[PDB]
Swiss-Prot record:
Function (record text): Has an important function as a repair enzyme for proteins that have been inactivated by oxidation. Catalyzes the reversible oxidation-reduction of methionine sulfoxide in proteins to methionine.
Full-sequence range covered: 197 to 361 of 522
Lineage of the species this protein comes from: Bacteria, Pseudomonadati, Pseudomonadota, Betaproteobacteria, Neisseriales
Record's comment describing the protein's domains: Possesses 2 methionine sulfoxide reductase domains (A/MsrA and B/MsrB) and 1 N-terminal thioredoxin domain.
Source domain of life: Bacteria
Region (Peptide methionine sulfoxide reductase A): 3-155
Entry protein name: Peptide methionine sulfoxide reductase MsrA/MsrB
Miscellaneous note of the record: The domain MsrB is stereospecific for the R isomer of the sulfoxide of MetSO whereas the domain MsrA is stereospecific for the S isomer.
Active site positions: 11
Residue runs in coiled coils: none
Protein family per UniProt: In the N-terminal section; belongs to the thioredoxin family. In the central section; belongs to the MsrA Met sulfoxide reductase family.
Length: 162
């Protein structure tokens, strides 16, 4: 029926809005994943270096989209290279990553990253790790762009897949 995948690719306000417009995506929940603390607030993540990455929990209809499809959509809007931000993204708020909750997904993600690397001259730095921890962002952050259309940080979601 449904499957979930966790994606970190920058400000979750934009990523969330992007995925909820895709046909087949059932829900997109903004949150904080794979950090070193429990139940962090936006302030903790942004200022206290808790290690969490702004992440979107994407739930999709397995009858409409495959995990591979979701990943291709992901690669269309994320910067999977070191150019995503200055220096090492390890443990940073806007780092790129795909966090799995099933052992089978790890191979799908690995192969997908390998294929994506084929189209990049620079090395990809996207993390492929299990979902260590995930904490829902404050309610104020959910559907942020639907409530605040001019928020800082689109049509790639309309383009059909291979």
């Amino acid at each position: 029926n449904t499957r979930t995948i966790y994606l970190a690719g920058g400000c979750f306000w934009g990523l969330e809005a992007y995925f909820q417009r895709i046909d087949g995506v059932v829900d997109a929940v903004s949150g904080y994943a794979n950090g070193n603390t429990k139940n962090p607030s936006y302030e903790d993540v942004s200022y206290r270096h808790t290690g969490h990455a702004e992440t979107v929990k994407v739930t999709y209809d397995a009858d409409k989209l495959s995990l591979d499809d979701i990943l291709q959509y992901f690669f269309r809007v994320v910067d999977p290279t070191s150019l995503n931000k200055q220096g090492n993204d390890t443990g940073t708020q806007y780092r790129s990553g795909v966090y799995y909750t099933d052992p089978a997904e790890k191979a799908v993600i690995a192969a997908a990253l390998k294929r994506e690397q084929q189209k990049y001259q620079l090395p990809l730095v996207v993390e492929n790790e299990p979902l260590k921890n995930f904490y829902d962002a404050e309610e104020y952050h959910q559907d942020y762009l639907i409530k605040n259309p001019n928020g800082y940080c689109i049509r790639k979601a309309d383009e059909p897949l291979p």
